Assembly symmetry: D3
């Protein structure tokens, strides 16, 4: 039942050069000067100053997002917030401001291409409607390579802000956001804490047999349009470099996760898989009656978690 799920630890797909690909990709990122930029932005709020933050990342694409700071003498604890797949509305400015009102200097990084950042990477060949399969035929060209690296830089940028306490930076997000939170934490020692609501991009090879809704199906859709058995092999190969089950091993920050047992977008199994590959101070909140949706009960859970580690 859910007993078999608590025990599920798929086999990892990481390839021999897993660490070298990421070490090499971090070295390309280091190659690009951040050139951070700040610009005050007016919003109807009291006790919080809002800014437009800009910096340069992998491939020289310009990343953007709103940066809200508690209107009070710092230094402050900080949060880098990551939005969901194709679910960024008005740059999620309202959520960002609210986080700042909670006492966190928080930056909502917009995911290149979807949110309002720039994706500089060429599109090698055809792919299914969406971002999931863009550059899927090579880990060098894969969409999430750039985005993952953008997350790391996000942390590098804010960490340098005088108002930010570099030792009290948290990384949070839901679905796609949760995956970026984990990936970032796995690739960077900057974040002190991790909060992922039902994380995405996890256990691709199973998520494909079990998901009943977009956008894990984009992969299936891609394979329907490209039947080449070699294509499928290469695709799953490049996907393993970004799969949470392979990155979870590198996370040593205390991390809190959530999952709804009727979630059809991000199937419970895929989330448990990720969780069971974490070997760090961790916890998984399980909600029997919720799917891929805002879970009230968990909200208050992560507020405590964050307060107890960052405030």
């Amino acid at each position: 039942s859910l007993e078999e799920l608590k025990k599920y630890k798929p086999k990892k797909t990481a390839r021999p050069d897993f660490a070298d690909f990421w070490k090499k990709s971090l070295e390309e990122l280091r190659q690009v000067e951040a050139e951070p930029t700040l610009e005050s932005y007016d919003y109807p709020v009291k006790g919080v100053k809002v800014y437009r933050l800009t910096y340069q990342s992998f491939g020289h694409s310009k990343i953007e997002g709103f940066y809200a700071v508690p209107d009070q003498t710092g230094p402050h604890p900080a949060l880098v917030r990551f939005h969901g797949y194709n679910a960024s509305y008005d740059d999620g400015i309202h959520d960002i401001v609210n986080w700042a009102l909670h006492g966190y200097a928080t930056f909502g990084m917009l995911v290149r291409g979807q949110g309002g950042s720039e994706d500089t990477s060429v599109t090698p060949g055809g792919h299914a409607l969406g971002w999931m399969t863009k550059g899927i035929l090579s880990k060098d060209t894969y969409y999430y390579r750039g985005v993952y690296l953008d997350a790391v830089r996000a942390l590098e940028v804010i960490q340098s802000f005088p108002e930010v306490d570099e030792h009290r930076i948290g990384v949070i997000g839901g679905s796609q956001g949760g995956a970026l939170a984990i990936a970032a934490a796995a690739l960077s020692d900057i974040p002190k804490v991790v909060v992922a609501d039902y994380p995405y991009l996890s256990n691709f090879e199973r998520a494909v047999d079990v998901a009943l809704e977009q956008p894990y199906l984009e992969i299936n859709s891609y394979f329907r349009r490209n039947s080449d058995p070699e294509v499928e092999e290469k695709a799953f190969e490049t996907l393993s470099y970004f799969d949470l089950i392979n990155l979870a091993g590198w996370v040593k920050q205390p991390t809190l996760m959530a999952i709804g047992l009727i979630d059809q977008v991000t199937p419970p199994s895929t989330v448990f898989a990720a969780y069971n590959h974490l070997e760090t101070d961790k916890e998984l909140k399980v909600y029997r009656y919720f799917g891929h949706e805002f879970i009230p009960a968990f909200q208050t859970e992560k507020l405590s978690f964050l307060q107890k580690h960052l405030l």
Copy 2:
């Protein structure tokens, strides 16, 4: 009412610099050497030789697709076939081969990003899931700018083939394919004939109000994510440069169209709009009981049309 539809002809949205934009765009295309590449490809068919065709286009992107030729001494009539939005399966090789079996040296151009070509253009900023709104904030960066230009070059490349009779080249496609067929014909004098099934990318400002299905709704979806009123204005502005109702005026080739009266993807009105802006030897086949789908009746219609004009 078929009556109301038959008389529907919306005011053009073409901006004052419409012609200049395309002249400048064509000049950027001319800037890139095609340097075409051919490579024999094995396929279980007799009487037809299949190839992988490659060439360079706008932004120096490698454009590809299968090229099937009747295995008989030419020169042959030629077809450049354009596939539907997100509807290219295995490069539509089977359809291409079949066209060749009909006596046409035919090339199925893969649309950069979706089919199997290479889209070299940067992604300026955010956009809705899909290609519809990529680079939507400027006609210079818009997704279909590159693709339109790829279509023109496709014609330029195959037209230079010794086995191809440059005087007997047709351009065909359905939905997105039909739009590319028309656009290509509008921007190039190479094609002698045009065949468009329920054409896409037409009458954007109405499509967004009548479409009950994807993906004219990616535009709507894009506006939901970007509420700025200035964004909507700019978006529709850049869209007018690619809208069939503005390009139809340039088509002088004999062109045949189809439309199903229950089509919810590519609404009848948007297709009539395009048709009513054509000022050329034209015809619109109307099918009361069909939607956005293969229309058997029209298939035989376009076979005759093509045979009469290209197999003359």
Copy 3:
């Protein structure tokens, strides 16, 4: 079509005893002591104290909800927030706390029988699944009679709080919440300002013909079960006593509204009807591409509106 909607103003359905019914109801409510009850409640937030607020209302029903106050020297501006139909999750505590973080001592009243309050009123006879048609055969027994009165008292309770500035109280809500916001403002002079998102319970006689989704259809559903032509007559009769188009006339507070042109739950026409019956400093924000859902662009709209009038 926006043009037809802009000019749409249906004839009022208010019966001749409309005013008397409400005077006599507001009077039965005066009959009940409020007997408020405050109780601190722990919540992972800084700068805000959270309470459980209790009070007695019409019928001797005990109404409840969370009350969050800015943890800073009063007095503060106040908001009474009303939740949507069957859409109260965990008493919407997270939203309430967030409002307090914005500088508003805000109370989220739970709708009797729906959200967490007590509905003391008998159920006269059969009715369709839901609250819409409960006690529908008489304006004395109708479900929303009690709830409307609960809203008025809500204002009466918080207004008496020493930390609350009685002359800076706002009333807000979406859908059902928006209707309660308007109704409350119409029946009470306490609220200084009104914000309603796609308001509900408006223009019943048309809603039943244009609604393609629940719950306006509960009325239709009720008539299918009770074919008696008299029943329909009586039903629409009692409904007119609660219809926004009949109450809008009494609203003298500056009020801000929103409506999405593809809203199928709360049809644009029904909302315009309400708006066009307001005779006060008013504004209607129209969103072409939105339905019955959170509208980001409007959230910032009401923040300004509230800030300029209450802060």
Copy 4:
């Protein structure tokens, strides 16, 4: 599948005070004077007289329903018919008349609050849309407490009629009706026979995990709105007092049941559970190709059963 269903008999959930609760409840019912009322009702039929029957029950609620009697000298066998959840159309008068035409003095009790009767019980707090979770936080306040008691009284009233043969009274119903039929038989010795189609309100703790359709889902829906873990425990606690698997033990009348193997409203397992807890002259008609719908085959089955035992 059928094999495992036949042998499915979940452990009872009846709490230690199960019997006391019902003894006390029956005592409260006895406290209220029946004072039943009859009123002739014209209906286009021959060989039958139709009446409107009224009486008082738990909480002082006036329960009603059409009462049709064979227009022939008595005494007659009698049936107390119970309608389905939210499925009472025009008081199901046509079905009632038809039963009378079959030779049964039959009364169609309308379920208080939904069918066409009065529910006098207060609504303690919030609950999910529907009746399922009304007063769910206490067995004293739970919705079906009153309704169950109404069923018992129904039998007490029609049993006192001179035209009714008290020794030949049957209790029948489908879904919700079937549950009331069984519950009534379990709480009263009046009924000689029981016939229930795919009975409802059975094996709650499993129903909530297998139901793919309303309304066993109102419970799930209720928990989504009230995440408190205590709430769920209390809810299932109060539900056990009304669960058929706990009441079936008291049924000593010959009883006939039906179940369709593709029923998604009232899952086969939940019905088998009830059946396997009956310890009397029981029979279970199983229909492989039917769901939650009128089963023609079973219709003729129960006609024989009733004719055999009552005519």
Copy 5:
């Protein structure tokens, strides 16, 4: 809109040989000997005898159906009941008995091919899934030709029964049944009265444009498979011979009809068309909130209608 519907009366499509076709068809029917067959059948009811009735009709096909007679010295009024399209379950026996219990010697004719009679007519060529388009390319071969004639014979057979009062025979049915009821009445003087619930087979040329649900869509479906435009014309040509709007002119019996304004199977317009083409003593009961379904209110309506005219 009820306004527009009330006045809707499309031009007849009857071809010039309309009358001749039916005269010739009736002649062919007369050519076949009824050789009726009655066989007692056991059913759990009292006061009613049930039989299996058999007779021969057009094309030498054996038509069947249950025949229930009031177990009391006749002669009795009689009803020939026609079932819905693909909606005959167990020969619809339970309803035939219930009609007998109302004092009517009633026969439920099973429609050939669907119900349980025998369709002897060859299938000329391809057609869409269903009966709608079987033999559609010629009025001689069309499916409903045989069925219509079966209905006429049904009346001829039962009328000859000694227990049946030939002067008091009614014809009733819903949807397909209603169409057969009307058609039968139009082609035979035997029936004294007609009751059709939302009749089918009417205004084919519009039905195909307004129907949002089966089975009028079978025609559309047939044209998708056979694009030949001459084919659509021949089809509509043969259909006119069976269209109610063309037969309604021959009905001189008092007839009662019903229609639900949200009916999507049998669109209101098509039903109004039929009723506006009736020049007999007619009446149309209109139900705003009902679709293609059992309408309680109308049930009692037709009971009175039948009782007044037949009892």
Copy 6:
């Protein structure tokens, strides 16, 4: 589940008189004179002549379909193509012509009542909407009896054509077509090869429990209307005479099959069952990401298969 599926081989349901029934049925077919008729038909294609073929079959019913022949000196390899359940649009003329363009003299038999042949068989009693349950109460009256026999005759007719090489006739089809292909091959030695995509009419007793889509459900639907337990008994009895799992044993021809693992119309299990009852040179192509739809990958598979065996 591929491992469980690969080993799935349900016990045959063939009744003791299985062989006799088919021997007797074939005898009745032989009783009817072919009397085949040919009629040139116009179609916009070069290198192919199209005809409308007519002949008489079981019950003296007229069976028909288009017959396309490569416009050249034969003899040619031949294909009998069978269409899907209720899925014959315009007699599938375009597909037939395309097959001819591939070098095959191919005949698309229209299934009686569906595509365009005549079903002379009486309808014994009631049945569920559709053809599935027509005459279901007896194997003598069952719908597919006639159709199966029509398939055999189809082979007998085309085989007699001078332009057809009787030694190189293939039988192909998808879903219902695949079942007819297999059935035909099982009842006739004429066909040299068999290609069936997601075959239908297979493992009825399980299909009715796993099918989430029409039309295996017509059977379920039929039982809902006829609750008599003796009806279900008789129904499954008559169905066993036409179930592929019982016929597969007779197929000697090399046969190629396909199945998509997410097929809900024709469940994988039912198809594996059929495949595992084949005792011949066989192969099953399995596609993980496809359902009951055109599978581009398998298309090219069967082209090779057919080319190797028929075009040598």
